Enzyme design. Structure first.
Site, mmCIF file in Angstrom:
data_model
loop_
_atom_site.group_PDB
_atom_site.id
_atom_site.type_symbol
_atom_site.label_atom_id
_atom_site.label_comp_id
_atom_site.label_asym_id
_atom_site.label_seq_id
_atom_site.Cartn_x
_atom_site.Cartn_y
_atom_site.Cartn_z
ATOM 1 C CB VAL A 1 -0.839 -0.638 1.408
ATOM 2 C CG1 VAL A 1 -1.624 -0.850 1.421
ATOM 3 C CG2 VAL A 1 -0.273 -0.224 2.803
ATOM 4 N N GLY A 2 2.332 1.141 0.146
ATOM 5 C CA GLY A 2 3.166 2.145 0.620
ATOM 6 C C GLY A 2 4.666 1.933 0.819
ATOM 7 N N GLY B 1 8.399 4.096 1.944
ATOM 8 C CA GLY B 1 9.417 5.714 2.367
ATOM 9 C C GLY B 1 10.626 4.665 2.673
ATOM 10 C CE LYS B 2 12.450 10.666 5.485
ATOM 11 N NZ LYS B 2 11.221 11.151 5.050
ATOM 12 C CE1 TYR B 3 14.074 7.417 8.267
ATOM 13 C CE2 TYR B 3 12.716 8.556 8.056
ATOM 14 C CZ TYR B 3 13.454 8.752 8.518
ATOM 15 O OH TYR B 3 14.920 9.348 8.788
ATOM 16 C CB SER B 4 9.223 0.902 7.029
ATOM 17 O OG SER B 4 7.939 1.380 6.412
ATOM 18 C CB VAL C 1 3.718 0.869 4.409
ATOM 19 C CG1 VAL C 1 2.602 0.161 5.092
ATOM 20 C CG2 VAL C 1 3.962 0.954 5.084
ATOM 21 C CE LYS D 1 6.925 1.829 9.885
ATOM 22 N NZ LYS D 1 6.925 3.047 10.846
ATOM 23 C CG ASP E 1 6.904 12.842 10.336
ATOM 24 O OD1 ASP E 1 6.698 13.289 9.611
ATOM 25 O OD2 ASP E 1 7.171 11.541 10.186
HETATM 26 C C1 LIG Z 1 -0.188 7.660 2.609
HETATM 27 C C2 LIG Z 1 1.513 6.863 3.176
HETATM 28 N N1 LIG Z 1 1.222 5.553 3.370
HETATM 29 C C3 LIG Z 1 0.638 4.780 3.026
HETATM 30 C C4 LIG Z 1 0.353 3.624 3.741
HETATM 31 N N2 LIG Z 1 0.595 3.376 4.600
HETATM 32 C C5 LIG Z 1 -0.088 2.613 5.571
HETATM 33 N N3 LIG Z 1 -1.430 2.806 5.328
HETATM 34 C C6 LIG Z 1 -2.838 2.014 5.614
HETATM 35 N N4 LIG Z 1 -4.156 1.875 5.457
HETATM 36 C C7 LIG Z 1 -4.238 1.510 4.097
HETATM 37 C C8 LIG Z 1 -4.799 0.792 3.559
HETATM 38 C C9 LIG Z 1 -5.211 0.404 2.187
HETATM 39 C C10 LIG Z 1 -5.099 1.380 1.291
HETATM 40 C C11 LIG Z 1 -3.576 2.080 1.219
HETATM 41 C C12 LIG Z 1 -3.794 2.748 2.850
HETATM 42 N N5 LIG Z 1 -2.735 2.190 7.098
HETATM 43 N N6 LIG Z 1 -3.457 1.994 8.290
HETATM 44 C C13 LIG Z 1 -3.070 1.610 9.333
HETATM 45 C C14 LIG Z 1 -1.273 1.933 8.985
HETATM 46 C C15 LIG Z 1 -0.710 1.818 10.357
HETATM 47 N N7 LIG Z 1 0.146 2.408 10.764
HETATM 48 C C16 LIG Z 1 -1.327 2.303 7.615
HETATM 49 N N8 LIG Z 1 -0.351 2.502 7.038
HETATM 50 C C17 LIG Z 1 1.570 4.454 5.433
HETATM 51 C C18 LIG Z 1 1.265 5.619 4.640
#
Ligand SMILES: CCN1CCN(c2nc(Nc3ccccc3)n3ncc(C#N)c3n2)CC1
EC number: 2.7.11.1
Length: 328
Positions: free
Chosen positions: A40-41, A43-46, A48, A63, A151
């Site tokens: 789902v994403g 970053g420089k630190y991990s 996800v 993460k 942050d």
């Molecule tokens: C905004 C950048 N990035 C996005 C991904 N990420 C991220 N994304 C989600 N939820 C999610 C589910 C589906 C689609 C998109 C996001 N979550 N949900 C809880 C945490 C936690 N802890 C988290 N971190 C970390 C931050």
């Protein structure tokens, strides 16, 4: 000198058991207990991913951390644990590692988030008031727990618009507040970095998060993300100056016997203050009422000591409908 105006003695009264995070002994769970479902994403630190808890089959967030120092990792964990159960504070479910490489992964609760880039533009006047309010509850809570997030930004505020559920995430920069302690100013993201960080004022506090919040708020009502679009630490301070004006900046510097770096003081120059209304337009007019302006104005102040505290912000009249709705 400089101390927080509220919650200054939180850690002073609590035993080492609470803030001495370098004494933490991590308890690892079973990695296999969590399987990846989709990234789902990153970053420089991990990196996800949306994962799944094989046992209960419930959705979770995995993460996968990149190489980090043991100290930094026990800090995020100790803090997460410290804030567990707090209003709108993302819950840390587990902590695992890869036997072979020792690569660690933090397992958090899942939040069906909708990207702010797309979500925010659809938010109504009331939606904005509501979510900011929810986010404020999280800040007052952690501040009341002797902790600074350091942050605050949209990227770290997960929102399941459908269920109107909000969570403040990514406590990887958070710190415990100690009166008089001098912290690294290399925190938060550029667009949300407060003046204290931009002028190297190291004995900052909970108030830094309020400037960040204010930045988020301004972008939302003015429909201009990010509100302060700079490209480097120096240019961030210049963008801030071209709006609040340099007189305020000078008085600020003078109050804290702070001397700006020559080249920096060169860029800033001299700028008159621009009324908040000079940012109103057909695209954001339905969002910029006086209350919204009065509120924003009391957040974005050079002197972090002048900014509203999270508790004070939650009581501003701008949020009255949200409060009245809740108390039912
Ligand atoms: C905004 C950048 N990035 C996005 C991904 N990420 C991220 N994304 C989600 N939820 C999610 C589910 C589906 C689609 C998109 C996001 N979550 N949900 C809880 C945490 C936690 N802890 C988290 N971190 C970390 C931050």
């Amino acid at each position: 000198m400089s101390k927080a105006r509220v919650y200054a003695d939180v850690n002073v009264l609590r035993p080492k058991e609470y803030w001495d995070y370098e004494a933490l002994t991590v308890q690892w769970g079973e990695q296999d207990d969590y399987e990846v479902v989709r990234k789902v994403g990153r970053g420089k630190y991990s990196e996800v991913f949306e994962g799944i808890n094989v046992n209960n089959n419930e959705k979770c967030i995995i993460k996968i951390l990149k190489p980090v120092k043991k100290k930094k990792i026990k800090r995020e964990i100790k803090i997460l644990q410290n804030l567990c159960g707090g209003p709108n504070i993302v819950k840390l479910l587990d902590i695992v590692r890869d036997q072979h490489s020792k690569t660690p992964s933090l397992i958090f609760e899942y939040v069906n988030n909708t990207d702010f880039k797309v979500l925010y533009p659809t938010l109504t006047d009331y939606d904005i008031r509501y979510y900011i309010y929810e986010l404020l509850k999280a800040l007052d809570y952690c501040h009341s727990q002797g902790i600074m997030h350091r942050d605050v930004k949209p990227h770290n505020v997960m929102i399941d618009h459908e269920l109107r559920k909000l969570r403040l995430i990514d406590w990887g920069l958070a710190e415990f507040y100690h009166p008089g302690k001098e912290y690294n100013v290399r925190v938060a993201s550029r667009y949300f970095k407060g003046p204290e960080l931009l002028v190297d004022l190291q004995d900052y506090d909970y108030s830094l998060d309020m400037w960040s919040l204010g930045c988020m708020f301004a972008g939302m009502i003015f429909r201009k993300e990010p509100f302060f679009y700079g490209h480097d630490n120096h240019d961030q301070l210049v963008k801030i100056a071209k709006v609040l004006g340099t007189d305020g900046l000078n008085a600020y510097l003078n109050k804290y016997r702070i001397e700006l770096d020559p080249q920096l003081e060169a860029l800033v120059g001299r700028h008159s203050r621009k009324p908040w209304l000079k940012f109103m337009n057909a695209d954001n007019q339905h969002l910029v009422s006086p209350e919204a302006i009065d509120f924003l104005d009391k957040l974005l102040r050079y002197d972090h000591q002048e900014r509203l505290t999270a508790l004070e912000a939650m009581t501003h009249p701008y949020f009255q409908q949200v409060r009245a709705a809740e108390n039912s």
